Amino acid sequence: KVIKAYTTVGSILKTWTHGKLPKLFKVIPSLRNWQDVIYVTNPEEWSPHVVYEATKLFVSNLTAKESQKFINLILLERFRDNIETSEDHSLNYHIYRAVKKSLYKPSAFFKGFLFPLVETGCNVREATIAGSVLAKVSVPALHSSAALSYLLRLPFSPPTTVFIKILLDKKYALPYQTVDDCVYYFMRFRIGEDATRVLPVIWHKAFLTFAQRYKNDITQDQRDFLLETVRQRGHKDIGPEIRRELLAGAS
Template identity: 55%
Template sequence: MGKEQFSRMNAKAPRHDPLHVQLMGPSENDPLPQGKQPRAKAARNERKNKADANFVDAKLSRKILSIAQEQQDEIRREERGGLSSDDDEEENTFGKKAASGGNRNFIPTIGDSDEEDSDMEEADDFGTFDEIEIDQRDAELLAKFMPAAPKEKKTLADLIMEKINAQNAANAAAAAAAASGDVVVPGSEKKKGPLDSAMDYADDDETGDNRPMPMGLSPKVIEVYSKVGLLLSRYKSGKLPKAFKIIPSLQNWEEILYITAPENWTVHATYQATRIFTSNLKEKQAHKFFSLVLLDKIRDDIADNKKLNYHLYMALKKSLYKSKAFFKGILFPLCESGNCTLKEAAIVGSVITKVSIPVLHSAAALLRLADMEYTGPNSLFIRVLLDKKYALPYKVIDALVDHFLRFKMDPRPMPVLWHQSFLIFAQRYKSDITPDQKQALIELLRFKTHEGISPEIRRELVNSVARGEMLPEPTDDDMLMDI
């Protein structure tokens, strides 16, 4: 007989433990077999790590609760910002009740709307700007630099009315020529397109507005955009009509925008419109929208409430992403108006401080402000732009030097804003001026002084190395100290 082969399959299973031992199960304190010791230890460590992971210490708990409280406060703040005190229960533009809820059966009559591009962005630093406090003497000095007659400001309605009056004059001239017997060449009349109508004006009953409407538009177009304007005058939140979103793509977008009556828009609608027009219009067209619509809304709100509404502030911030259009449509008209208040300048300046601007656009803005007729807000904007510490071209540096030097023989004392902008210029760009400019600015301090600011300006200029100057050679004592 051969030897029986041993195999694990044929091996007898070890005798089981007694029943009462199996029921009790192994304990963590029981000694484990030598071969199973590492695995059991790893299992115990894993259980311990899981228990530690589920534990949150007191410091982390306080931090989590603080973040949750801030989020709740922000939600409540946004809800209060999206509703006026008089319209908390009023139905919004698209049939949704404001925060308390309500009837949702209203369906807009103008087309469908796309989903909103994005929600309102965070603005934790909204409205934070340095409050400018000036005494009575400085206020009188600033008043001396204000023009006697502020520059006349044109609105979108004025622009459209000029076109309407010009068209009326042309029609009257054509009618007079026809009455005098002049021959009219066939086909010389302007042919009307499919959207045009024989009616030059919309009926007051259709639009509900007594304003004259642009000529050459279909009554249906006027009716649709008049209803869009009515919706925007009540808009709080939700989707915008497609008819409004396509306005930037229209060739006569100014006339269509005029029909919607931008002066009656809510602040929420103004913000949404600014987002759409900033994203879809070119620089030249966007600066018209900023100048004719957004600037007036901002100034009126500041004049009425002594501060700027959250949504208008965000609209102003959004407009700065087209910086060239922002400067041409908001900053320059504001400075040239002649009646810009320091509060308006401080709010606009705070937006400029928070948003990054291309260097060339900032340089061009400084060049324009330096050559502009001086007012107090000009110095504030110059100070804000200089404080961004951009590397400016020498042409801009020279223009700023000339800007300060032109007041050397001015008999009027300069306001503190002028001295502050002078100090910022000396601190940031003292190494970019020529030696002659440096001496001229030091000489200027003899004529225009401020007891608290002028000594600092002199110290910055005297201890600086001008453009083209050689650095002073170290003395022997300095060399010995280095060794």
């Protein structure tokens, strides 16, 4: 039996304004019953300031097991509940900065919050919101290459594709697993889903902002099948720019 001031913790931290933090709740990384007693807090009661400080301390105490302990049962769900209460689809600024401070540690972020966002109830609006808060702040380069590999292996959905679109306008320096990833993306989008799914201007801007300058380690057969991408999926945005990138392409 815990000392039973967690009810008092929720009582203040529902109507917090500004000031300080509880010290048991601060040293709770180094007390072994932290999740078993945060169930006793039963924290459906919540505030922006305490969300900020709580995810600060949880990324401070974030590994794989702690990610599955807290963030995969209630935290992304509280993100989801607040964007289902925000009637303009207007997420709040403190909750934004809580997600930016969540994106600090890349150690368990994948299975932490990147997997179950596409799992249940995913719209393209919240997909672009999550992609843009990825585009604001720091991202791990090689872990994001790994992310691009498994998210392109993951099945086709416009939320996954707009995550790849924003993370491709992140403007990396392309490695070899990624260029093989994009060419077997082209082996994915062939005739295939070309009779089962339609890809308008959004996917056209995907390979258009790809083929802006993402061309550097590309074989002449790969130049051929990007020209065949253009030949089949001709939109109006194919002629001078993709011809120009074919002319200025390299080995």
